[model samples]
Target: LPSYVDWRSAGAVVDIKSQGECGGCWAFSAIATVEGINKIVTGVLISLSEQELIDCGRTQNTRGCNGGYITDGFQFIINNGGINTEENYPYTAQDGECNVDLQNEKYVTIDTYENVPYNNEWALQTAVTYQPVSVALDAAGDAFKQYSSGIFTGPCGTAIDHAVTIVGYGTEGGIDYWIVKNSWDTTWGEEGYMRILRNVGGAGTCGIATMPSYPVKY
Candidate 1:
């Protein structure tokens, strides 16, 4: 198992995006990672379709407007032949018919890594190697109480409720930081990203992060 980690230097934060009380985090997990992964893998950025996953990937074990299981969610995309960017699929967030017109959309040229077990260390390794990996964030109703900045040591060490993506990990000023993308939007913390001390063994969300996965070929 991986030990505790922290950021040596502070990393840039991103904007927080809202799932609108919808448990569409299953899609957000992949979409957020792809948004960053596409940039890392292809040298270009693309907004993948979360709405597509929310509406179409239903059988993936996720209730459209409710919640879902992380591991099963990725498998849904993999087994469904694959996914596309929002440019091609367009997301309305509202329920609609599942129209997976593979030919109509552009398949990410690079293969994605996926099917990772929902384990903490595995999730960290994937983040380090793959850049960003969708994860289940522990955020119940206490999001405000848990709101903090700069390698917080409170809620982070305690598993609560919610799910987010681990986008990257690095050390800043001798501290290891896990770069996480949140659905809370920019105002939430450090834009939309949170730099958590990567001390997975201690406690909290670090310990609960799910496995990191990507498209098989990519």
Candidate 2:
């Protein structure tokens, strides 16, 4: 197994964002994957719009800013033609009316997306090595809300409350960890990041491997 991988050093990861008061972590997670893969495919890192998904991506079981899954966001992108740039659509941090004309403001599109095999940490690792993978975690705990640094050996159990991005992985003092990028701004959790214990088996750390997903760009 590889000892390290960092998407930030590779220039695929972008600036961390804040979801404000919205329960739209799923949109941010989906946007992060799109931003990463778009950079990998086009050699240009543009901050695409999460607001596009919030307001427009209501298809495939997504309920605007209330809640959603990464696959729903990706399916919306594929069916809606594409997603728009943040500058073009911008983040409202809340839901709004969907505008059909805005679909033409696309800055990027995906060929397709897939859910990495559930509860498979190795498969999740393989997916993140190629691109930032979207994942959901049981972020309903107070410890998760106050996380700062170090590999989180959570007393926190799996409940799958929030969505985030898995940008890289590595080991610290023989403890394997997954480098997760959150949408809580740079002021929180090691400059807007967290490391969860990896390869712990049984649905994988905090249910992180339970819902691993990624977008494929060609």
Candidate 3:
């Protein structure tokens, strides 16, 4: 079994994106997962539009910018044909009316998605080994808001208020951590990245293992 991996070094990760002040981290997480899988499948890393989901994906249980789920976003992409590129649809970071006519602008789509078993870090690690997995975490804390670097052991509790992507995993200073990519932009954390402490009993750190999911495509 492989011990250490970094999807960025493998050329499968995309540029970091900012969700602004909107609670559209769900859209960004889904976009990141799709982008990673598309790169792994097609060898072309294109930035899919979160705006597409933020707008169009609301019909299928997504709450637009107000807050949503990655699984809902994936289902919307699959059912609505596909998603568009950011250059085409673009992100406004605010709620908007759904424009289904833009559905014609297909960038990439997935067949289905899978949710890693809840509260299982090993299973989450396995899922991340396959592709960057979409995950929700307890980010409703000052530590998460002011986080700059290092393996975040958290002053965060199990609130599960934000969505992000798990790009890879490794150990730092004997502390195993999940390499999480946040949507708060590069100005926050370590260049828009965070190393969240992992394998702390169950539920991982800050419920990071609670709702891990990823797209499946051929």
RMSD (CA, Å), each prediction: 4.7, 1.2, 1.1
TM-score-better candidate, 1 vs 3: 3
lDDT (C-alpha, whole model) for all candidates = 0.58, 0.88, 0.88
Per-prediction TM-score, please? 0.73, 0.96, 0.97
lDDT of 3 by residue, 1-218 (tens): 36876899978888889999888988999889999999999999988899888877885456887888889889988998788888888899878877767767787888999899999988888888888999998988898899998999988788798999999999877888899999888999999999989889677898999888999998
List runs of model 1 lying over 4 Å from the truth.
Answer: 1-16, 100-106, 109-123, 141-148, 156-160, 172-174, 200-206
Identify the runs in model 2 with alpha carbons over 4 angstroms from their true place: none
lDDT string, candidate 1, 1-218, tens digits: 23332221212112346776666776777666655655665666656677777777676357665766554555556666556767677656566677757423546544535555555554456544645565655555354335657864444434534567765566667876676777766777777667776655523354544545554435
Better of 1 and 2 by lDDT: 2
The local lDDT score (0 to 100) that residue 174 gets in candidate 2 is 90
156-208: candidate 2 lDDT, tens digit per residue: 77889899999999988999999999999999899999999999997887889
